Amino acid sequence: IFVYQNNITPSAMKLVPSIPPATIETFNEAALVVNITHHELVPKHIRLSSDEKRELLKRYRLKESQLPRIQRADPVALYLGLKRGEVVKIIRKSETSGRYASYRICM
Amino acid sequence: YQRLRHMVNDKFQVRSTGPVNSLTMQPVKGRKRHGGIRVGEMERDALIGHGTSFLLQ
Amino acid sequence: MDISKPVGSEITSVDFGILTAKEIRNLSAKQITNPTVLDNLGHPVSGGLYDLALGAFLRNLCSTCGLDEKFCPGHQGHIELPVPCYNPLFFNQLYIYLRASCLFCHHFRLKSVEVHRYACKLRLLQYGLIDESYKLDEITLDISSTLLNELKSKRSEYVDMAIAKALSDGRTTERGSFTATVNDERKKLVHEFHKKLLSRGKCDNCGMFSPKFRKDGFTKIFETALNEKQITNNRVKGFIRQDMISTYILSTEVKNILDTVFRKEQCVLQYVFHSRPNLSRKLVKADSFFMDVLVVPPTRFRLPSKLGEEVHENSQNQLLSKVLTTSLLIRDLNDDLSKLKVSLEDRRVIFSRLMNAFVTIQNDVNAFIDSTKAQGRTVPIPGVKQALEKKEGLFRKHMMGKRVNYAARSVISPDPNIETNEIGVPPVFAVKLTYPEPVTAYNIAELRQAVINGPDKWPGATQIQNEDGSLVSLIGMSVEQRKALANQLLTPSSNVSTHTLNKKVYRHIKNRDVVLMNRQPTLHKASMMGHKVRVLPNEKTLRLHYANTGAYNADFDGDEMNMHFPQNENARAEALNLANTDSQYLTPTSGSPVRGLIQDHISAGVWLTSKDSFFTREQYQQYIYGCIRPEDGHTTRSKIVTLPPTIFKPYPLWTGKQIITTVLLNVTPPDMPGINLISKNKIKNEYWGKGSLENEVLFKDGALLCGILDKSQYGASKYGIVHSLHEVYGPEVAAKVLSVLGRLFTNYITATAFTCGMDDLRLTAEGNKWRTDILKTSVDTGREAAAEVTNLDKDTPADDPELLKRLQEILRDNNKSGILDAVTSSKVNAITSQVVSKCVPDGTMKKFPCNSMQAMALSGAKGSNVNVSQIMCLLGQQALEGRRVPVMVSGKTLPSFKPYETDAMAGGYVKGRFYSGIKPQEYYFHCMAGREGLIDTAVKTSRSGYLQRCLTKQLEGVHVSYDNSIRDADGTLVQFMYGGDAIDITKESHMTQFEFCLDNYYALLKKYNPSALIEHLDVESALKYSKKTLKYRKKHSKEPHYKQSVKYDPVLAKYNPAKYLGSVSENFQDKLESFLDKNSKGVNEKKFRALMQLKYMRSLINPGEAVGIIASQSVGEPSTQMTLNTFNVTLGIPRLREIVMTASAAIKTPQMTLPIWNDVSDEQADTFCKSISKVLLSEVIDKVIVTETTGTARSYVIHMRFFDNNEYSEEYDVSKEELQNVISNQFIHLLEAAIVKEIKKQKRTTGPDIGVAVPRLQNMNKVQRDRQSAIISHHRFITKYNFDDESGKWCEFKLELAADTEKLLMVNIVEEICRKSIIRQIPHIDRCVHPEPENGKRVLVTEGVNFQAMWDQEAFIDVDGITSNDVAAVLKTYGVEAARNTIVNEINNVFSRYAISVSFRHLDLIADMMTRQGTYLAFNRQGMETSTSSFMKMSYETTCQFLTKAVLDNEREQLDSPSARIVVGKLNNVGTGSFDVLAKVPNA
């Protein structure tokens, strides 16, 4: 995780996905002032294991992409550090059912 | 009391099997010509709504 | 459709492709070469558009199949184009590939390794693997060929391995996985590929430049010559070629360039043009974009239109004849070209002849395909693209919608004597509408009579279909032939080829048939229900019961209704069990009733169920049989049971309420116990006298023991008697009760009438005295309010000269008049309310129940107490567009009133009533307000038609799957569970009505029969888990949502609600447990819990239910009620359009709701509001004095007289220091730029052009001196700058201009820059206000959006509760789930404002569909782009455009969307089409 102050050079930004399997994540300290997952409208997002995903895709007979989507650059997706393929479990409070578990695939 | 000039049942029609257009082979437009009643997109939507697939068919 | 004619083969999928010239030449029935259509005499010319080889025409037999005009299907022909032409639809694509390719090495100018990278990514995307396509970019080693070829090898190795690995598992099939997100990733790449392809100038393979190609509107390409820098580049790179061994460009040259490029770049184009893997192994050839031939459609689809006597030429034949003339001409040009040549040199002519030949045939080809791509002819003939998009389009006008057979239309007339589930069919329709009834042993008797009766006697038959397939019309036949055919109906089939079949009788519509009643507009599925046919003799109109009035939204004001007569048993069953009226008691919008009695019946019930209503044995029994007829199957006991009288001695008498008890006793099942309900009435106990309990509706063991019955009981009102009966006994019983009550009240209104008269409109002498006395205080009110707004002590006289001057100030300003109008209105309306409260009802001469005018308003039969008060008391203040009466420039509201009259009457306050009459001044004012409403109905552009159409087309496929999840047509998951609990809204009503369910325990326990279910379900698994989740929930009660335990997720997430008793929503669980704790009451608290658990199980939404259409109908239909204008933020349909239809990132009224802490006071919050609100220089300036003096140089002395320092510092939170910085840095630089611009504008245009037509209308301190000197160095025109630093009240500065600058309007120049100069502004925010605490929450509403700025105000705002209406802004900062929650809240705000309740299950579905891609997609062409069905897309808009995109993808339409299925005539996969029916056969 690299917390930068104002801006990063376009040449320096190319060096971010240059060393696999190691991953690099950049964040502006002004954007980290307030935690987004602490907001009342942002439910609890939980990243699922390769086994938990495998089980979910079986119960509903789903294909990776056949699921609701979460963008790889989505604020919460960037917070949990989601990679493409990773499934996230969303426990959201409904004004009809209360606690409800939904899911989203990061592509 | 006043009697209004309009005879409201002027568009009164019934069709079992009447003439059809050559291209679509569908009931032709025209009350007096033994024409068909249109089942538009909204009525299609309503028949999908009831989940009544044979009524739509 | 014939059931005797089954079909064994079916279309499973449609493949989009391009016809090859070789393919067309073989299938062609005849080559068309002649432009003439008819020979002399009248026979079609050989080789022409009407050739008999193209099918039977002009009573001649087809020369291909030999059949006549009826049986001949017609045959396709072809036109041989003498030169290839660009196909109009694919011109844009071939153009992209032409500009992207190198004219030397004949490869794309993009580097081979980069091209291979796209081919790799696109191959991996043929299969559903997006993650792998991105992981390919990670594979990395002016660069040598030996190194780059290794990169291509390593990349190809990963592609082959990733495909095989996923192929081994169930990740992708041999045919490849294809989803909307996969499609989104493909569409993104194919776009990026073409963008990179077009960007390259110099070829990366061979460094030579290619000449750029330009284009015009029509299909024609030109070649722009290279520049000298690029020509010399070709020379120096000319030697390396040897070692290896504007001008128009012809169609042949382009085809030849693309021919080689499509061969050399075949690997990438293989995946660029194939959506899924190319199993057919077909070569991607360039000649697909070119037309060497034109297919000639069969004569059958090109027949000449006949209108009466005149036979008009077909427009397609006309366009085709034009192509034929040009083709013959080019054949001659090529023949003359072939002749001669030794003599040449001037070859500029032979190319000019060629260019004309090519551009002429091309235009004729274009004109035939798409007219809006052909040259203007001195309205053109429509092309085939125009034919598919004439108006709404062929798909919308003739596929998604169609004119139908066996249907009728008529004006509806009311009828209370028919059943609520019936329709009165006129005998005119009954003798024409027939059903194909197959003759059998069980119905031979019934049909023999129909056959004898014939087509004019009901119940008859119009036709008889034999087993051989032939038809025998009974129309012309006499009783003798009909009798003979009837005795031949059940004869055994001699032919073995039809022994399986039996004869059919096309019998008249009987009283046992189903019909589909439709009242347009069909805004919701309740406007299209199934009714039971009841043929009524001597009728000329469709008769309909009053209970149906609500659902159809049909008033008997000369309305028309459509009757559809479905022609098969599967369609019958559907109209009788799914779309039937009784199953539509509750609307899915709010789960509330839309069925009930409307007017006479409500007024009848208030009288019949009144204490005063008594009945003798003779009267009582008559009322019973009058509405309940055992012969019509109204009874459940086969004998009319009767209660004993309520009065035994002296005379035997029955009460009115006892009739209601007896009706239920004979219509409800005997096996089930009586209904138990404690409800309320619309009529208060005070009206029924002292100590009455007649408001409390009491039902104990199916007996009305207390209270009368209103609109609140047997009307379309929730938790009434009919609704209570509907929940306990079902929909069929509730329907019977409605029809029974409907008859009873009709019969009761016949024996005991109901009337309204003048006596019901009169006040008593006492009551009328009160009216005059309260209205006597209203004279003072006019001047009192006028003196309050104007601010004048001791209450100045009405003729005061200072007051009249003060009221004039108010007259000239729209805002000031608003304050005056709102104050005077509130004061006079308070006088109105007083009159009404006193006089009604305690002052009315005739009183309830006898006062029928009063009775109708209280019963809810018709009218309200407001209408009653206008009749008997006063009309009140006539409000016009939120304000009072409009006033003239003279200060007069009418020529009768005094200028600036301080009277309530002058303002529009009507003291008069409709009983006594209204004065002419009041009459004119009432005319204003009365018309005002009708004007609004004329000026209302907002329509719910397109809003609903956009939602329904994108949600049609969305339904409930057998795995309880909400899945789209293509199987993609939208929701894991409907509303998160899987409950049907038409069931979620008494599910929280625990006391009701308790009082009816044994009745509901018998309803939800568990004895036949206990062996099919689990009774503990879910119940144990429910306790474990409740345990961890109670542990983190005070804890916030982010810190809450994620150990155990909800019981519904782990256990199927239809299989496990206890897998209930935590909302239901909390509510149920809370009832058992707060209410300690032979039913145990444990056995009741099981019943409610079982009720939830039986309240689940059925798999197959089209929740998509239902949701859009539930948002569409009630959005018609909000078509009226405002009485700041965007409301109604425009706000709903901002969300659903356009998903705007640029909202009209962007806002932020900031929750303020408790430690921040009301004064502190208001100071904070000022700190963020945008402050302009204009807002602090009082006066500007410009002293323009010309001496020596134009001297401008600009003096800024501001308001007092303490005044603007307490009103804007702006300091004198803050004012100094803005003027010295911003204002002067902005003023100097404005003056310079005005000098240039003066010298540029000296004046307007005369004669030329214009467009139509329709002593100073040391510190101050250093400051001034520094500002002089930074500004080119100022000389002096003095600012009030001690007091802070003024700013003076001198401006020196040249002698040539002359006259200028400095005041107007300064004014404009002041209101443009910002003192302090927080980005994207305009004003921060402090409204009244919303539902107890202390909040601040911002007129702008910037979260990061509010994040810094943590001391004032709770950053975890900062709300915003802007969805896109929320998505950008807080994520997709937050934006999703904003959509469901914002749509709810639109409905809650108009007091409309829409189930959150609908909103959540809509929001989930908008956020399906992780973005914010709207219900429009843009959002739809990421959808599998090209047929669904084609039937929405731009049919030919979506078709082109489908063909280029080589797409397979899987026919899984409702639209696609309708296109190909396949049964819809929703509801009854969500499964298959198989027959169990005994023999092996």
Ligand SMILES: [Mg+2]
């Ligand atoms: Mg009406």
Ligand SMILES: [Zn+2]
């Ligand atoms: Zn033929």
Ligand SMILES: [Zn+2]
């Ligand atoms: Zn090249």
